[PDB]
Design a protein around this ligand. Structure first.
Ligand code: EST
Ligand code: EST
Ligand code: CL
Ligand code: NA
Lengths: 245, 11, 242, 12
């Protein structure tokens, strides 16, 4: 219907590549006692600054700004931690055994043990990065996956009680199909057979189930750190966390 | 309409 | 392995034949639904379904070729997702209701008998509606349930044995993808419709994972409040999600 | 040992 829904696969991929957010630095100082509070402060301060850039990125995802503001809010509230995590895993592919939170903050699982309950999450994130490495995930595939997360994660909770809200839901589903088309087009241009294309599409989308799982566990962890007053959290982070109850 | 996220998305 | 040499038709046939029975609840309609009674009925049903789920898993091609440790871990990861996808499937013919069992068909108002449950009921009802919108077929359902079993626990955390089993799992996941596509092609979908539907179905699995995590938190809350006693099996399946 | 492990050893 719209200009966004008419884009070709090449146009979609090109737009998503151009929308990529900047890589931000942490505050890490080797002179500081690497305490639970210090590490959590680094991670949440970084997450808060990344969220502002994530909002700008989302507005560049084709069709996203054609949704109502309430729908845009809903999708970002649902997806934000999944998006931070897939970004982290992507940045970490080139560093076996480490998570590149930022160029100055590369942590291994033993460092993750500095925060109660964190090493289990680190291990899941490390396993996902290893999977990306095994698959030789490409940037074009990564950006498609991130756009799929944004559009899919809140879409089952999307209300369609009116003919307009039903229109919005249909637009989201049509755009999800177009991003699938773009992923397949990229794989086909890369020389994969049809069988390999479908197998790889499935492999990539199954990773999204793991990213959802890790986000759920991370949200529980962040709530725990909030409750225990381990770390002060920004107003925006507090609201994003609150949207998950 | 009062959420921070709502405000940031209008910029 | 013999499993990795099966054809797409053989894989779908095997999975259809392995389908577990539909069990009845212990519901006594002489009694009203308190929080404790409803939780007792649902966990008693889950416990009895788990035995049949273990039987079913042993029939998923290649599963019994894995180490018992890997079989344990995969089922520990996936069990509630598997119960939930089965529930949604059973409920497709009952808009607005969840067919936990043929004698326990519940609406969201009945879900309110348990604190925190209606939120999960609503997600499951929305998933049933999605299944109806997609006209999900039994062949697609059984492929998705087998994918959950093999995938949910595959990325939890160096030994060579860990790599050998993981490679077997990935090969069989690819074979199930092949089978799903084959079924769609046989059903007349165009090549573009095939990849679009494949993606639509696999994205359901992200929502099923989400619902399982919320359900696992809920079950732990019920346990932690001494609402319902859980079987030793359920206590251990729940504790694996510590 | 754990119940699930024991049940996975029965046949079928
Ligand atoms: C949310 C947590 C703090 C912020 C962390 C972060 C911070 C920045 C980032 O780019 C990714 C992630 C993913 C892991 C997140 C953590 C998982 C649990 C912890 O509370
Ligand atoms: C796990 C719960 C009890 C068992 C329930 C069940 C029980 C049997 C079944 O076939 C499916 C489900 C899905 C929802 C589950 C519930 C979600 C929260 C509650 O604690
Ligand atoms: Cl910055
Ligand atoms: Na900044």
């Amino acid at each position: 219907n719209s200009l966004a829904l008419s884009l070709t696969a090449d146009q979609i991929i090109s737009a998503l590549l151009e929308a990529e957010p900047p890589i931000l630095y942490s505050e890490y100082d080797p002179s500081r006692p690497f305490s639970e509070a210090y590490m959590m402060g680094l991670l949440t301060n970084l997450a808060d600054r990344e969220l502002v850039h994530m909002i700008n990125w989302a507005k560049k995802v084709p069709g996203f700004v054609d949704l109502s503001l309430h729908d845009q809010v809903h999708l970002l509230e649902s997806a934000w931690l999944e998006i931070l995590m897939i970004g982290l895993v992507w940045r970490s592919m080139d560093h076996p055994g480490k998570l590149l939170f930022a160029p100055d903050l590369l942590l291994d699982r033993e460092q993750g043990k500095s925060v109660e309950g964190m090493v289990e999450i680190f291990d899941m994130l490390l396993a996902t990065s290893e999977r990306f490495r095994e698959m030789k995930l490409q940037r074009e595939e990564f950006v498609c996956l991130k756009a799929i997360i944004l559009l899919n994660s809140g879409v089952y909770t999307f209300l369609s009680s009116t003919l307009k809200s039903l229109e919005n839901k249909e637009k989201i589903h049509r755009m999800l199909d177009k991003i699938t088309d773009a992923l397949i087009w990229y794989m086909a241009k890369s020389g994969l057979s049809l069988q390999q294309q479908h197998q790889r599409l499935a492999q990539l989308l199954l990773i999204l189930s793991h990213i959802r799982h890790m986000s759920n566990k991370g949200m529980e962890h962040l709530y725990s750190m909030k409750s225990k007053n381990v770390v002060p959290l920004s107003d925006l982070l507090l609201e994003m966390l609150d949207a998950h109850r | 309409k009062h959420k921070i996220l709502h405000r940031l998305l209008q910029d």
